[PDB]
Amino acid sequence: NEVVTREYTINIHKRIHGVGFKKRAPRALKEIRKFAMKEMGTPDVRIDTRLNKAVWAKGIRNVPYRIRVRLSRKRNEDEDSPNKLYTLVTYVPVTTFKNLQTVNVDE
Amino acid sequence: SMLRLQKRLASSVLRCGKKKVWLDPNETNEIANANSRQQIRKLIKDGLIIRKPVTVHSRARCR
Amino acid sequence: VRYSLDPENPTKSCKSRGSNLRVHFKNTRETAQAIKGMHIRKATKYLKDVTLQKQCVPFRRYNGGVGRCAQAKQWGWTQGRWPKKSAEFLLHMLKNAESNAELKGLDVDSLVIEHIQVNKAPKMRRRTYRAHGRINPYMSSPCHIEMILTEKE
Amino acid sequence: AKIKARDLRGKKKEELLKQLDDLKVELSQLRVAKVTGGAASKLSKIRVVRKSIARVLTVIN
Amino acid sequence: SSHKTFRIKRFLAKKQKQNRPIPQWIRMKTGNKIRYNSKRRHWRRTKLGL
Amino acid sequence: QQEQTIAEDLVVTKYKMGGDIANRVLRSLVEASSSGVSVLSLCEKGDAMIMEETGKIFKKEKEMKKGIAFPTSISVNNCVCHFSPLKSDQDYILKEGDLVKIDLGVHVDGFIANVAHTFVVDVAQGTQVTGRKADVIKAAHLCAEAALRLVKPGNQNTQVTEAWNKVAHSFNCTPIEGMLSHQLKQHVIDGEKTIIQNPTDQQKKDHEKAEFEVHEVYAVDVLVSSGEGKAKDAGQRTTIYKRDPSKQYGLKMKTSRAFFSEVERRFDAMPFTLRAFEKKARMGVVECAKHELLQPFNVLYEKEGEFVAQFKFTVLLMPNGPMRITSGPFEPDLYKSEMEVQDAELKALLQSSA
Amino acid sequence: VFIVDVKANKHQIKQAVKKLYDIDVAKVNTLIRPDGEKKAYVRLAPDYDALDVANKIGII
RNA sequence: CGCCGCAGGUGCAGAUCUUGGUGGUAGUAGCAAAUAUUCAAACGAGAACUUUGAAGGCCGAAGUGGAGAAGGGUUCCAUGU
Ligand SMILES: [Mg+2]
Ligand SMILES: [Mg+2]
Ligand SMILES: [Mg+2]
Ligand SMILES: [Mg+2]
Ligand SMILES: [Mg+2]
Ligand SMILES: [Mg+2]
Ligand SMILES: [Mg+2]
Ligand SMILES: [Mg+2]
Ligand SMILES: [Mg+2]
Ligand SMILES: [Mg+2]
Ligand SMILES: [Mg+2]
Ligand SMILES: [Mg+2]
Ligand SMILES: [Mg+2]
């Protein structure tokens, strides 16, 4: 199917290692978008504003190490665009990241 | 579309700064028609233009 | 108007032209040399890839200081780039030529770029300010472009 | 319809000044019409009334 | 400045009134030879004499 | 999708009602106008009857807006149309032997029946009207018959204009340059589908090409002068305005705002006259029309001493033959011309009644 | 609101308006515009309606 | 324009010559002083840069704030391109 939705956790720390202070949160958002593209195969990725807020919660350089997100591949059947599907990535608040799998979620 | 005039007028009418003027992001077409301070007042009554509260600076730590 | 290199017979050919286009003449000359002789569909795909930085144009004559890239190896060259503005201007001219072919009633699935030429347009004057109270030019280098497509299959 | 200098010279000061006053109120009305849009006929009448005022004043002087 | 004399204000008014483009019907006249107002003055580029 | 067309019998019946009511008002007006009358009185009277009769009709439904679709407009020997003076304006007194042009429209449920007719006032019993004016009215009525016969799905809108030019040249006159007829639908008097009369290059290149369609109303207008066909303005007040529901602007004056609200309440989209208000209306209208909130209908004047005629009537287009709902009282016995139709095709279309 | 001669003072403007419009005025405010023309705001007496006066003048 | 005479402001590679135009350099140097941006949406052919909203920051009242003098002179304000 292609209206799937899954929950992942992203190692922002691993993808952000080595980046200078004033570019860490912007690079974390670029890395989240790249992760969504690699996972769902759709160029059009919409970052949720709540997820952006979560990335920027601790400032520009002290980005959280892990972020639990949910990727929902949806249909772009609302306009004429080259991309038929888009992936909307939202924020999933968790208390701990231990033993957290990639899980298929229901609608 | 472009609401620079409306933000200026609302700041003047509400007697705050443009920092505190909140224009409804969804009623953009309705706000864009307001080319007068009386229309700004009408939008303020209707709640499409809202004066945001002062950013909190607490003196509890000092006390 | 007077093109250079009139076609062998102007029944299976179509023409497109542009004057005083604000693109760099050197970049556009290299891009035009890249797409010269291509089939029209291949040239459109190539120009879109140049815009996406998936294929490069090789800078053969105007290559002073131009960097190296892996995609220049498709050509017999070392220095290549991805002129986005030149690719877009040439894509627009190609679409205009294809519409002209539609108007002339000659089928566009067989069109091949048989002639393409980039000339220097009159320069445009702007100003820059230098160290000791001095003024230097800041010229633009626009270009005329002309192209002739021909059926061959 | 226009006034001429040759048929103004037989008239006296009172009616010459009356003619001048009529032309002046006409010119003021024409200027009002000029600023409120008006029409091409009323815009072209401005020069005619101005020359008539000049003609009457020349005869008086 | 805000404080100005009547003569200065009137001079500025004349320089204001003559800083406008040519009427478009001028170029349709017989033997015109005029294309655009070459005496245009921008406030930031060229400063007035006074 | 929710528009109402002639597919419904109720729509049919109230169109017939609009035609009958416009016809009876015009029939009263043509008799009431005589020598030594005032156009202000005529306009007031034409509105006065229409108001009471539209109020009494459909007394069981008091939710719909019905009444004037086009104000009473009189044009006498020097005006083209859109003429309706206020009380403050100098009135026009009807002399002997004047030909006058009447325009008046009614609306029911937003649907329009709008009719214009030119006739001569104070015609003696047994006399003949003779002159250069005797051909222009007759040519306008021949245009009326031509339009009635030729209005049909499949006949292009560029054919009626050439037929009218042909009959005008056959009568050695010409229509006023640049006049528009329209396709009339619910709550619309200025529809996109336009018919053009005596065009030139600019109006022809700005005009559209279209094919007549089924289940629609037309207001086909013939408006022909006996001189050159050119008109301008003579510095007289514009009295007819219509609210344009497309564009909006924030009115900054209380008088203009109250005037615009009253216009929305009474004449929401239909043309009105400033007589229906005055002191504050004349001030509100300038601010309203500055920002294109009201389309004006300016008074157009021909040359002094010229004669111009007009006919117009809403024709519905049904699949098996169009019908006329508003007709003017024009008789060939009391009105002849010194020249007739010299075109075989024009004879063929005029001799065939609908 | 009128455009007046730049050489006319408030007394002259008041008397001119009174004479050539048959109205009584309360006060005259005066400025000179950036283009050089003098502008006069003539307030009318309470018993005169400036709307009606503007209608008779023809500037509505 | 040729021929017979007449008369010159009569022949250019240079003068760090005069004026005008054009090259290589060269798609090069460079667009690095004052911490910093990001997400979504709207308008739009087109958005790193416009507008709105959300977030993260800065000026930190000797301000990147609010008002004036001198000077400028319409830059002010709407609408449109
Ligand atoms: Mg180099
Ligand atoms: Mg380098
Ligand atoms: Mg510099
Ligand atoms: Mg300097
Ligand atoms: Mg300066
Ligand atoms: Mg003063
Ligand atoms: Mg010499
Ligand atoms: Mg030399
Ligand atoms: Mg030498
Ligand atoms: Mg470089
Ligand atoms: Mg740099
Ligand atoms: Mg700080
Ligand atoms: Mg300050």
mmCIF file of C-alpha atoms (C1' of nucleotides) in Angstrom, chain H residues 1-71:
data_model
loop_
_atom_site.group_PDB
_atom_site.id
_atom_site.type_symbol
_atom_site.label_atom_id
_atom_site.label_comp_id
_atom_site.label_asym_id
_atom_site.label_seq_id
_atom_site.Cartn_x
_atom_site.Cartn_y
_atom_site.Cartn_z
ATOM 1 C "C1'" C H 1 35.434 61.060 -62.260
ATOM 2 C "C1'" G H 2 39.449 61.798 -66.524
ATOM 3 C "C1'" C H 3 42.684 65.650 -68.826
ATOM 4 C "C1'" C H 4 45.026 71.243 -68.784
ATOM 5 C "C1'" G H 5 45.898 74.827 -65.109
ATOM 6 C "C1'" C H 6 45.078 76.909 -60.081
ATOM 7 C "C1'" A H 7 44.901 76.597 -54.308
ATOM 8 C "C1'" G H 8 45.795 73.994 -49.854
ATOM 9 C "C1'" G H 9 43.805 72.930 -42.754
ATOM 10 C "C1'" U H 10 46.828 67.495 -48.536
ATOM 11 C "C1'" G H 11 49.211 61.289 -47.127
ATOM 12 C "C1'" C H 12 50.602 58.511 -40.002
ATOM 13 C "C1'" A H 13 52.464 53.100 -36.362
ATOM 14 C "C1'" G H 14 54.521 55.510 -32.804
ATOM 15 C "C1'" A H 15 54.293 61.487 -29.537
ATOM 16 C "C1'" U H 16 53.314 57.702 -20.985
ATOM 17 C "C1'" C H 17 49.592 61.613 -28.374
ATOM 18 C "C1'" U H 18 43.493 63.298 -28.549
ATOM 19 C "C1'" U H 19 38.423 61.202 -28.734
ATOM 20 C "C1'" G H 20 35.557 56.779 -29.452
ATOM 21 C "C1'" G H 21 35.196 51.624 -29.428
ATOM 22 C "C1'" U H 22 37.048 46.579 -28.266
ATOM 23 C "C1'" G H 23 40.150 42.398 -26.286
ATOM 24 C "C1'" G H 24 43.187 38.873 -23.161
ATOM 25 C "C1'" U H 25 43.198 38.924 -18.017
ATOM 26 C "C1'" A H 26 38.213 36.264 -16.823
ATOM 27 C "C1'" G H 27 33.288 33.490 -15.744
ATOM 28 C "C1'" U H 28 38.769 35.309 -12.628
ATOM 29 C "C1'" A H 29 39.472 38.438 -7.959
ATOM 30 C "C1'" G H 30 35.732 38.795 -5.329
ATOM 31 C "C1'" C H 31 29.928 39.418 -3.194
ATOM 32 C "C1'" A H 32 34.013 36.894 4.739
ATOM 33 C "C1'" A H 33 33.461 43.576 10.451
ATOM 34 C "C1'" A H 34 29.161 43.751 14.316
ATOM 35 C "C1'" U H 35 26.350 35.295 17.278
ATOM 36 C "C1'" A H 36 21.083 33.078 13.510
ATOM 37 C "C1'" U H 37 18.117 31.016 11.753
ATOM 38 C "C1'" U H 38 13.832 27.216 11.190
ATOM 39 C "C1'" C H 39 8.760 25.039 10.159
ATOM 40 C "C1'" A H 40 3.877 25.650 7.876
ATOM 41 C "C1'" A H 41 0.545 28.412 5.019
ATOM 42 C "C1'" A H 42 -1.111 32.420 1.590
ATOM 43 C "C1'" C H 43 -0.578 35.369 -2.767
ATOM 44 C "C1'" G H 44 1.843 34.300 -7.148
ATOM 45 C "C1'" A H 45 4.160 31.806 -13.766
ATOM 46 C "C1'" G H 46 8.020 31.737 -10.311
ATOM 47 C "C1'" A H 47 9.621 32.104 -3.020
ATOM 48 C "C1'" A H 48 16.368 31.003 0.927
ATOM 49 C "C1'" C H 49 14.863 36.620 0.646
ATOM 50 C "C1'" U H 50 7.494 39.164 0.348
ATOM 51 C "C1'" U H 51 3.122 38.559 4.040
ATOM 52 C "C1'" U H 52 0.764 35.907 8.198
ATOM 53 C "C1'" G H 53 1.325 32.286 12.169
ATOM 54 C "C1'" A H 54 4.698 29.231 15.320
ATOM 55 C "C1'" A H 55 9.647 28.589 17.257
ATOM 56 C "C1'" G H 56 14.779 29.846 18.380
ATOM 57 C "C1'" G H 57 17.859 34.269 18.856
ATOM 58 C "C1'" C H 58 19.808 39.550 19.056
ATOM 59 C "C1'" C H 59 19.572 45.114 20.351
ATOM 60 C "C1'" G H 60 19.197 45.141 26.395
ATOM 61 C "C1'" A H 61 16.691 51.956 28.233
ATOM 62 C "C1'" A H 62 24.648 55.424 27.242
ATOM 63 C "C1'" G H 63 19.103 50.468 22.556
ATOM 64 C "C1'" U H 64 19.136 48.050 16.562
ATOM 65 C "C1'" G H 65 13.513 51.954 21.228
ATOM 66 C "C1'" G H 66 10.328 56.776 21.110
ATOM 67 C "C1'" A H 67 10.914 62.102 19.468
ATOM 68 C "C1'" G H 68 13.515 66.719 17.668
ATOM 69 C "C1'" A H 69 17.686 70.652 15.576
ATOM 70 C "C1'" A H 70 20.819 71.170 11.049
ATOM 71 C "C1'" G H 71 20.654 69.099 6.132
#
